């Protein structure tokens, strides 16, 4: 029943997607909690796929998850910045593209965070 700008209404293929949620502004040396929302919009499940989070292009954390049809999982990770500046958080699912999906172009999320 969930529908948003990242989810539109086929059941013969899975469709992995990712979205990042959390503070867009954080203070140096302060614990920040983010959430990676990984969903399978398709009618076929995904026994195993990799999810990765990058901060300014450098890998930060990795997960191996499974997602049944129309299932969503919330992955979490904490981040305590040490320096200030504009950081770009990226999240990817099936980056190695080992899963044939309805869309391979909605497998990447971008989220900007300002550390002050």
What DSSP line would sit under 16-57, residue for residue? EEEEEES-SEE-TT--EEEEEEEEE-SSS-EEEEEEEEEETT
CB of 19 to Mn ion, least distance (A): 12
Q: Does 10 bind Mn ion (CB under 5 A)?
A: no
Which of 40, 90, 92, 107 is the binder for Mn ion (CB under 5 A)?
Answer: 107
Q: Which stretch binds Mn ion (CB under 5 A): 29-37, 53-61, 63-71, 99-107?
A: 99-107
Q: Does 19 bind Mn ion (CB under 5 A)?
A: no
Taking the CA of residue 91 as centre, how many other CA atoms within 13 Å lie in the half-sphere pointing to its CB? 24
> CA 56, CA 69: separation in Å to the nearest integer?
32
Q: Does 41 bind Mn ion (CB under 5 A)?
A: no
> CA 54, CA 69: separation in Å to the nearest integer?
26
Within positions 46 to 75, which residues make up the interface with Mn ion, using CB under 5 A? Answer: none
Which of 15, 40, 90, 91 is the binder for Mn ion (CB under 5 A)?
Answer: 15
Q: Does 106 bind Mn ion (CB under 5 A)?
A: yes
């Amino acid at each position: 029943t969930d529908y948003d700008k990242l989810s539109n209404l086929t059941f013969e293929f899975p469709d992995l997607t990712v979205e990042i949620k959390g503070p867009d502004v954080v203070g140096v040396n302060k614990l920040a909690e983010y959430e990676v929302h990984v969903k399978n919009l398709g009618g076929i499940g995904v026994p195993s796929t990799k999810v990765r989070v990058y901060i300014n292009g450098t890998l930060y954390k990795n997960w191996t998850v499974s997602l049944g049809p129309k299932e969503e999982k919330v992955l979490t990770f904490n981040w305590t910045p040490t320096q200030e500046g504009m950081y770009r958080i990226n999240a990817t699912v099936d980056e190695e593209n080992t899963v044939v999906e309805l869309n391979e172009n909605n497998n990447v999320a971008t989220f900007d965070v300002s550390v002050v």
